[PDB]
Amino acid sequence: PASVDKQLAELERNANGRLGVAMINTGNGTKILYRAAQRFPFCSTFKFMLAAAVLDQSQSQPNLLNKHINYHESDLLSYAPITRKNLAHGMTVSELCAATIQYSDNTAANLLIKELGGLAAVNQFARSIGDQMFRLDRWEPDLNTARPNDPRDTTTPAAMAASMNKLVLGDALRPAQRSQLAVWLKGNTTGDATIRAGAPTDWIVGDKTGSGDYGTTNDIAVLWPTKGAPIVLVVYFTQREKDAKPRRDVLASVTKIILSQI
Numbered sequence: 076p077a078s079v080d081k082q083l084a085e086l087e088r089n090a091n092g093r094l095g096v097a098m099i100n101t102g103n104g105t106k107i108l109y110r111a112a113q114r115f116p117f118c119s120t121f122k123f124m125l126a127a128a129v130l131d132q133s134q135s136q137p138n139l140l141n142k143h144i145n146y147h148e149s150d151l152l153s154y155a156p157i158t159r160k161n162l163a164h165g166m167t168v169s170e171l172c173a174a175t176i177q178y179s180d181n182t183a184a185n186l187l188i189k190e191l192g193g194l195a196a197v198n199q200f201a202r203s204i205g206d207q208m209f210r211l212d213r214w215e216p217d218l219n220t221a222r223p224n225d226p227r228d229t230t231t232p233a234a235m236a237a238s239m240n241k242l243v244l245g246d247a248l249r250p251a252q253r254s255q256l257a258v259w260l261k262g263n264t265t266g267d268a269t270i271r272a273g274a275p276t277d278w279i280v281g282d283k284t285g286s287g288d289y290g291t292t293n294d295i296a297v298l299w300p301t302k303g304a305p306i307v308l309v310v311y312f313t314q315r316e317k318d319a320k321p322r323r324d325v326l327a328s329v330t331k332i333i334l335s336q337i
């Protein structure tokens with residue numbers, strides 16, 4: 076809608092950035108799409124796809140979520156608050172999934188990628204749910220360089236929204252697993268300043284944040300409104316200079332703007 080577009084372009088233009096938006100309203104099937112077929116560096120938002128891949132594996136492997144991983148010091152990375160907390164005792168795969176979603180723990184992500192059988196297992200999972208755009212090229216934290224015109228570690232807003240729709244709200248997973256994935260998202264701790272900040276206080280938000288160089292500022296969410304069906308919102312944003320500061324307020328403004336239309 077022209078009203079959305081103008082608001083989005085001014086926001087985007089005013090912040091000297093490139094913004095990508097896909098919103099799917101699962102109530103009526105209406106979508107709002109802005110640069111939605113263009114690639115953007117996903118940064119930590121990939122962890123959503125990773126947790127889903129693990130849930131997919133657990134469908135054939137019923138001990139998987141409860142498998143205890145005794146990781147070591149050398150697995151610990153600069154950003155690993157939960158895996159650090161639990162070093163002495165280790166963590167289950169389930170706990171690793173919750174920590175990578177809700178605290179964006181990088182050790183937890185790398186441990187789960189290894190559990191799945193490597194980077195290509197995550198991509199093949201994305202292919203298996205019909206996501207042709209998602210590409211994971213590097214482990215954490217290298218995947219967050221977000222360099223101009225570098226297609227490594229990118230997806231499109233449309234593809235990520237479609238995948239979040241199918242996994243959380245659709246039939247890509249079995250019921251126990253899709254329910255678990257929604258519970259993890261709803262317990263996210265990193266998302267207050269982004270899509271959550273832009274949605275009514277009486278709504279429930281389940282989201283995965285990501286950020287990185289070039290002031291990249293990303294958030295992907297399912298929104299549970301006070302009336303009607305759930306809504307999927309993906310927002311990717313990146314800026315001119317390598318050391319740009321993230322613009323979390325831009326994401327909240329996008330959300331405000333989009334939710335006005337529905």
Ligand SMILES: *C(=O)[C@@H]([C@@H]1N=C(C(=O)O)[C@@H](S[C@@H]2CN[C@H](C(=O)Nc3cccc(C(=O)O)c3)C2)[C@@H]1C)[C@@H](C)O
Nearest residue numbers: 118119120152153154179181216219265284285286287
């Ligand atoms: C993925 O986006 C990111 C994971 N997940 C995050 C998140 O969702 O909150 C981040 S970034 C967040 C905003 N700025 C800081 C940050 O950049 N911390 C940071 C980054 C790199 C290394 C280290 C470290 O060496 O300790 C810390 C928190 C969280 C790091 C990517 C970039 O890993």
